[PDB]
Design a binder for these strands. Sequence first.
RNA 1: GUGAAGCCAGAGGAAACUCUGGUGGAGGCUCGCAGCGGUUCUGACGUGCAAAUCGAUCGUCAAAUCUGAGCAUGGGGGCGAA
RNA 2: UGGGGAAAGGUUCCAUGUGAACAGCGGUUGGACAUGGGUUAGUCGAUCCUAAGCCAUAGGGAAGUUCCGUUUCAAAGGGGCACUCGUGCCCCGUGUGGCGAAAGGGAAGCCGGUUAAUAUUCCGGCACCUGGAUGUGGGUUUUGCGCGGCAACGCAACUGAACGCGGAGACGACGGCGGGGGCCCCGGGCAGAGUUCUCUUUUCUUCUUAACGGUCUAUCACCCUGGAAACAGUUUGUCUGGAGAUAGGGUUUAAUGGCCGGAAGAGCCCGACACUUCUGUCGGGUCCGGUGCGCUCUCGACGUCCCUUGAAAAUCCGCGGGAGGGAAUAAUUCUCACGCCAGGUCGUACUCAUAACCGCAGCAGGUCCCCAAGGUGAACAGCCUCUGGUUGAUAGAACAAUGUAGAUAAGGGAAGUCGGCAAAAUAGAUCCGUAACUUCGGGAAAAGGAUUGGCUCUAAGGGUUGGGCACGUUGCGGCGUGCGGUUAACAACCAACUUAGAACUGGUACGGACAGGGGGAAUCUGACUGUCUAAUUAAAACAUAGCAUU
Lengths: 113, 91, 202, 76, 23, 24
Amino acid sequence: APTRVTYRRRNPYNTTSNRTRVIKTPGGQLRVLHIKKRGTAPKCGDCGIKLPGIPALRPREYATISKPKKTVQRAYGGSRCGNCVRDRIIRAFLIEEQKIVKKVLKEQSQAEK
Amino acid sequence: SKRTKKVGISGKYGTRYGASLRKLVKKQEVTQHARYTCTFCGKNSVRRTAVGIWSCKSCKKTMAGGAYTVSTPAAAAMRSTLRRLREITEA
Amino acid sequence: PGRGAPLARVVFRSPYKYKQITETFIANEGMYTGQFIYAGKNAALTVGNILPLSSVPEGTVVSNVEEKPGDRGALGRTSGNYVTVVGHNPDEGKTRIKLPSGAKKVVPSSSRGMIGIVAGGGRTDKPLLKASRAKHKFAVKRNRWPKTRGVAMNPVDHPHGGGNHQHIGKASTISRYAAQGQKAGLIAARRTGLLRGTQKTK
Amino acid sequence: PQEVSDIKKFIEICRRKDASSARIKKNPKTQQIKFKVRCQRFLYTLVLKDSDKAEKLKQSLPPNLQIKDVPKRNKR
Amino acid sequence: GNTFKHKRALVEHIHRAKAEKAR
Amino acid sequence: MRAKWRKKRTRRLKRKRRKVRARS
RNA sequence: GUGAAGCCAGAGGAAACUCUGGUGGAGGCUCGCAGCGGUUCUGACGUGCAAAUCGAUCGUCAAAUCUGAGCAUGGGGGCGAA
RNA sequence: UGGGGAAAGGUUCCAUGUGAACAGCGGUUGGACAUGGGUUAGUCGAUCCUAAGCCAUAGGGAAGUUCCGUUUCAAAGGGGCACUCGUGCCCCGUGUGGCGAAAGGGAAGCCGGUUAAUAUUCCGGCACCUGGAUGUGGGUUUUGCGCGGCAACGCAACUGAACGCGGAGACGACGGCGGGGGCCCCGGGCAGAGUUCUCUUUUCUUCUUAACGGUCUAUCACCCUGGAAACAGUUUGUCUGGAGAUAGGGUUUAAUGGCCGGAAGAGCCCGACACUUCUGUCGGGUCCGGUGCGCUCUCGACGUCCCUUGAAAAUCCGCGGGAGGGAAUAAUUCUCACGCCAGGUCGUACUCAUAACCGCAGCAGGUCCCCAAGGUGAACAGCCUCUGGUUGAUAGAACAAUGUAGAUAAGGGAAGUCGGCAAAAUAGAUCCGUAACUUCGGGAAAAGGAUUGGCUCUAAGGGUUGGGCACGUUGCGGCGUGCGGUUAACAACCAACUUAGAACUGGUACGGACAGGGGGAAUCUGACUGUCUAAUUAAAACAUAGCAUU
Ligand SMILES: [K+]
Ligand SMILES: [K+]
Ligand SMILES: [K+]
Ligand SMILES: [K+]
Ligand SMILES: [K+]
Ligand SMILES: [K+]
Ligand SMILES: [K+]
Ligand SMILES: [K+]
Ligand SMILES: [K+]
Ligand SMILES: [K+]
Ligand SMILES: [K+]
Ligand SMILES: [K+]
Ligand SMILES: [K+]
Ligand SMILES: [K+]
Ligand SMILES: [K+]
Ligand SMILES: [K+]
Ligand SMILES: [K+]
Ligand SMILES: [K+]
Ligand SMILES: [K+]
Ligand SMILES: [K+]
Ligand SMILES: [K+]
Ligand SMILES: [K+]
Ligand SMILES: [K+]
Ligand SMILES: [K+]
Ligand SMILES: [K+]
Ligand SMILES: [K+]
Ligand SMILES: [K+]
Ligand SMILES: [K+]
Ligand SMILES: [K+]
Ligand SMILES: [K+]
Ligand SMILES: [K+]
Ligand SMILES: [K+]
Ligand SMILES: [K+]
Ligand SMILES: [K+]
Ligand SMILES: [K+]
Ligand SMILES: [K+]
Ligand SMILES: [K+]
Ligand SMILES: [K+]
Ligand SMILES: [K+]
Ligand SMILES: [K+]
Ligand SMILES: [K+]
Ligand SMILES: [K+]
Ligand SMILES: [K+]
Ligand SMILES: [K+]
Ligand SMILES: [K+]
Ligand SMILES: [Mg+2]
Ligand SMILES: [Mg+2]
Ligand SMILES: [Mg+2]
Ligand SMILES: [Mg+2]
Ligand SMILES: [Mg+2]
Ligand SMILES: [Mg+2]
Ligand SMILES: [Mg+2]
Ligand SMILES: [Mg+2]
Ligand SMILES: [Mg+2]
Ligand SMILES: [Mg+2]
Ligand SMILES: [Mg+2]
Ligand SMILES: [Mg+2]
Ligand SMILES: [Mg+2]
Ligand SMILES: [Mg+2]
Ligand SMILES: [Mg+2]
Ligand SMILES: [Mg+2]
Ligand SMILES: [Mg+2]
Ligand SMILES: [Mg+2]
Ligand SMILES: [Mg+2]
Ligand SMILES: [Mg+2]
Ligand SMILES: [Mg+2]
Ligand SMILES: [Mg+2]
Ligand SMILES: [Mg+2]
Ligand SMILES: [Mg+2]
Ligand SMILES: [Mg+2]
Ligand SMILES: [Mg+2]
Ligand SMILES: [Mg+2]
Ligand SMILES: [Mg+2]
Ligand SMILES: [Mg+2]
Ligand SMILES: [Mg+2]
Ligand SMILES: [Mg+2]
Ligand SMILES: [Mg+2]
Ligand SMILES: [Mg+2]
Ligand SMILES: [Mg+2]
Ligand SMILES: [Mg+2]
Ligand SMILES: [Mg+2]
Ligand SMILES: [Mg+2]
Ligand SMILES: [Mg+2]
Ligand SMILES: [Mg+2]
Ligand SMILES: [Mg+2]
Ligand SMILES: [Mg+2]
Ligand SMILES: [Mg+2]
Ligand SMILES: [Zn+2]
Ligand SMILES: [Zn+2]
């Protein structure tokens, strides 16, 4: 039962790509299994938090899963969190409104002569 | 429960480097490890990130400041002089 | 690394193309993320703005001052330092400035500068106190630490050479017009010894 | 390998061009009957508890399919 | 703080606190 | 999506159009 | 092993402030195993196992610690905490 | 002194046979000698990318072999459409080479069996990736490019050119805490084995479940209601809240978690018959719980440190915009399900060291990594044992001097000697006690004392589950409630260790082996930690922070 194991590939060094975990086989043996690295969650493009509703994969793996699993149904679906989308809409409206009043005030109250 | 008479934070240096040098470094260590109240949000969460960078844990703003204090007297005086120079002449 | 004086990342917009450009300035004390800054002849007298010296009044303090208009900054770019505007000369277009070393200089008025003082404060106030601390400082700059004394080498190595006692043996002030391999010591020294009074030169 | 839930879908699977063979495995200790069909990409398994539908299902399969009985202790 | 030595000490303190609160 | 991925889809459309012409 | 800042509770005083018990886990700190090194026996051997090794006793051991591969510097030249 | 690798070697690997020579004794044996045999990949590597760096092109030096220069003082590119048939048209333009990693970055394979010698490569079963063609089912559209949720967002699909924005690749050291896999440990059961003068419901062994999928869950965080001082919530470690807490209800990143397919048909353990060989055949079994400051790997939320802040490129995805195109019987450049075809080239045996590498050699030297059992014990200390592996270093007889290595001596105790050189003495843990001096941090384990075995008992330190009425529904109901109340804290069950006290007992012994600091009063000198004469000198010599000068 307390049996020792060996690597199954030619690399003998403990690098950030030589990742293994122990298994037990239906033949009653302790072996080693070589595993990849963990995925990373995409981040928001304004505040930098983890976006909800999107899986964490290695970059090449996103090329095979379907489109609705990689986005949420809203403007700026990926890459923005929703709190940031709320700020953009309000800020865009308020600044645009002040632009009109500043123009009208400047034209009327100062170019009446 | 005071557990130290005078050395304070510079008790990690044991009996090394001389008494005068430990006092001088103590003056700068106390002020660089303290917390300061944010100017933008008001909470008491502002710590030093790097030698001239200070960041707020709450509202996520970072600011350029002194080496071991958030502001320097020379910078504070200049801001008033600049304010007075521009204002009382142009306004 | 290797520098005091934190840096600032600023994003502008292109007047002729649909894109944006990112620059890297030196940070003045008081600047923060999310702040608008302005550059040009008609900019305002606020910390962090960049404008020609012809648009500032006497006594203002700036940093990263161009020696000539267009070279993008040469003077006063180190932590806790600045230059001072002294006077103008509008008919010919020159400005007098004062430098951190204490010297005076004359510069064309179209040179640009940034209002304020360079962030980084009084870095040199606390002792390093440990050999390892000085080692970490230079390990990211150059291979210059530690340093052996010339008086402790053999004559084949250094002019201060050998002898049955450690000593120099001749005057340590060396002429300005000497040969490479002879300049070791105090080069072209006007005087020597402990400075008692005030220094007349300004 | 994938599991099939009902009987109607399992019959429709067996009526496919790439259906190569099928077999029947019975576990008397736990009283189960398993129907497996070998297709191009997957092996489909259907699990039944009773035994009054196994022969009913068996006769409902297409006649051109080959069905075995999975003898105990299969030879190498 | 270093007030209650174990579980029994805390329970006795609670009973006396409610007894005086009763009055 | 990558450009090679998009090139395949328009290539299929062009073949299908010339074949449906050949059919007609 | 020792036990620095920060934090909790109680007690003393008119205040400014002071005392006690905990919590915490800092330091080119310390005992010591592996690695790294080489103080003494002026030990063994000294046509040696060995053109520098062997034994006992020793120095350091969480940082100015130890180490592989790739690359650079070429002889009045390099490199040198000398 | 076990099981596998990197550099280096190159057949040393396997079988059969053998006179001499080699294996510093022998030899029927051999890494020796002779004759034959042995290395199988779309998934493991190389091949692709860039780093420190090296070299072409434009140009400038040098009598010249050649030196510099890497984006420059250069007219330096790539994308689409038909072709009658290549010839012809039309857009964009700031920029424009290669080599360099078998430990950095990176598309994809697991289990069982098989040989004298290969296997994640062969056989059987069961999967996955990239590229290329393509048809059925389903989806959308009768007014053209989907519905649902207040919301966080969900669903099998669910148009999208130029140009632009963003994310992943993509990163330090140390500290305690929590979740998961493997190992260790304890109790019960079925099989087999060992011991049995006496004892022992006893001691030991097997009781397994892969990649790839489906389904139900799992910290952080985010959303809706509402409005807090008698301030509350809360970590081992004081953080959080009118910039919206507690509380109630939801959404979502993250399986090495539970159940199912794979899968018992496999593998393993017993028993009974056949069988010269060829050959085998048939019955049973392959369960159920607990514990932890345990060891090892992995994930998560926190914290400390810096005049130190801890790579780049290839490659893949989302979004802003709205160019072009399309049905009313058919149309559909639908990232949905299933289906068709292909994946070239080189390495792969064996050793990795008291005999396969480098030291003239089969040399006590040197040479980068992965896995890591039981007992004692603080422990990867020393000492004994299991799995696995060795029994190989020329031998036989005798016990003189002088040696090398290991040791003990009466009385005195450094009188020996340049000199206490060598040896001896001290040593773990618990409880007392602790000076001068001092940069107030230390000196300090200062100095100096006492105890420690065995057996029979006593006491303390925890977890889970229960709480009384009155209505209505539900195959003792479980609840929708209206309440009442704080058992003067009770009952049942479960579980390791750590600490303190007493009696008895012995040739007064008990850290019983191992392991394991001698101490004090002063002078000279360098502040300290660090560094050097490989092979006669480790120091008061060098470096260092601080100070001053140019
Ligand atoms: K999703
Ligand atoms: K310059
Ligand atoms: K150096
Ligand atoms: K020096
Ligand atoms: K001297
Ligand atoms: K001197
Ligand atoms: K410590
Ligand atoms: K050691
Ligand atoms: K020479
Ligand atoms: K290949
Ligand atoms: K194939
Ligand atoms: K190759
Ligand atoms: K290739
Ligand atoms: K390069
Ligand atoms: K030339
Ligand atoms: K590589
Ligand atoms: K073979
Ligand atoms: K259809
Ligand atoms: K739909
Ligand atoms: K890296
Ligand atoms: K863990
Ligand atoms: K664990
Ligand atoms: K475990
Ligand atoms: K154990
Ligand atoms: K796999
Ligand atoms: K409050
Ligand atoms: K703790
Ligand atoms: K390890
Ligand atoms: K459109
Ligand atoms: K092989
Ligand atoms: K092999
Ligand atoms: K090797
Ligand atoms: K042990
Ligand atoms: K041990
Ligand atoms: K003898
Ligand atoms: K003898
Ligand atoms: K003596
Ligand atoms: K003497
Ligand atoms: K003792
Ligand atoms: K003296
Ligand atoms: K030293
Ligand atoms: K020496
Ligand atoms: K020494
Ligand atoms: K030296
Ligand atoms: K001094
Ligand atoms: Mg010398
Ligand atoms: Mg000379
Ligand atoms: Mg001279
Ligand atoms: Mg000299
Ligand atoms: Mg140390
Ligand atoms: Mg030590
Ligand atoms: Mg000797
Ligand atoms: Mg001899
Ligand atoms: Mg052989
Ligand atoms: Mg033979
Ligand atoms: Mg011989
Ligand atoms: Mg012979
Ligand atoms: Mg022979
Ligand atoms: Mg041979
Ligand atoms: Mg591969
Ligand atoms: Mg060249
Ligand atoms: Mg030329
Ligand atoms: Mg290459
Ligand atoms: Mg690699
Ligand atoms: Mg395909
Ligand atoms: Mg789009
Ligand atoms: Mg399973
Ligand atoms: Mg699952
Ligand atoms: Mg809540
Ligand atoms: Mg199953
Ligand atoms: Mg079986
Ligand atoms: Mg082998
Ligand atoms: Mg080995
Ligand atoms: Mg050897
Ligand atoms: Mg050799
Ligand atoms: Mg123990
Ligand atoms: Mg003998
Ligand atoms: Mg002797
Ligand atoms: Mg004696
Ligand atoms: Mg005696
Ligand atoms: Mg005596
Ligand atoms: Mg001695
Ligand atoms: Mg003592
Ligand atoms: Mg002393
Ligand atoms: Mg010294
Ligand atoms: Mg020497
Ligand atoms: Mg020596
Ligand atoms: Zn955001
Ligand atoms: Zn703030």
